[PDB]
Amino acid sequence: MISLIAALAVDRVIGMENAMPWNLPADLAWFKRNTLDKPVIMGRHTWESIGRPLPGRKNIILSSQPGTDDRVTWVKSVDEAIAACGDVPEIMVIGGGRVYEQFLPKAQKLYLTHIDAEVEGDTHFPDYEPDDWESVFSEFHDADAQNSHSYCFEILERR
Ligand SMILES: NC(=O)C1=CN([C@@H]2O[C@H](COP(=O)(O)OP(=O)(O)OC[C@H]3O[C@@H](n4cnc5c(N)ncnc54)[C@H](OP(=O)(O)O)[C@@H]3O)[C@@H](O)[C@H]2O)C=CC1
Ligand SMILES: N=C(N)NC(=N)SCc1cccc(C(F)(F)F)c1
Ligand SMILES: [Mn+2]
Fold first, then answer.
1. The domain that contains 103 carries what CATH number?
2. What atom in ligand 2 is closest to the CA of residue 34?
3. Domain range spanning residue 6?
4. Closest CA to 112 of 96, 125, 97
5. Which protein residues are within 6 Å of ligand 2, measured from CB?
6. Is 97 annotated as a binding-site member?
């Protein structure tokens, strides 16, 4: 099964200057939790942003271009990336703007962290049809000392 996991701020903004503006440790904890032990797929930019493999997970990187680090698996297409994962229960696309657009069509579930923060960005999450998605999990959280905004963890499974 393929899955997208992401954090959308106001107006589906997900990144800016190769970084998630807000600071919500609750979110990352939630990322770590739902990605742990599962193949994860991302774009070259998103790789350049983390700089070091994500631990206890197979890291696949989509790049039309050759491979610059061997601590990870490089692939040149979406088909090549899913195949690179082998036959596993769930595949986590921690994607990237463009990586989400290509994978959304094959996704069976979406892990969305909706952030009540309004920052500007140069990268958005694909504009998906809510109609053809079911809400199976949704937990709201007020802002606290560690997290300055209110957020909601949401899990959608394609109908
Ligand atoms: N808030 C969240 O949950 C998330 C936020 N982000 C944020 O998103 C932004 C980065 O997003 P974005 O710019 O869209 O980039 P990506 O990380 O998705 O990288 C896209 C790149 O990977 C390669 N690529 C993508 N698809 C293919 C394909 N089918 N075949 C071959 N190569 C492919 C290309 O690089 P090449 O030129 O080498 O081919 C392309 O430019 C940052 O701001 C980051 O912080 C990222 C993930 C989750
Ligand atoms: N709930 C979410 N944030 N979903 C994501 N898709 S966040 C994806 C990500 C981008 C850069 C660094 C990280 C790491 F630091 F947590 F590894 C994670
Ligand atoms: Mn159904």
1. 3.40.430.10
2. 1
3. 1-159
4. 125
5. 5-7, 27-28, 30-31, 49-50, 54, 94, 113
6. yes
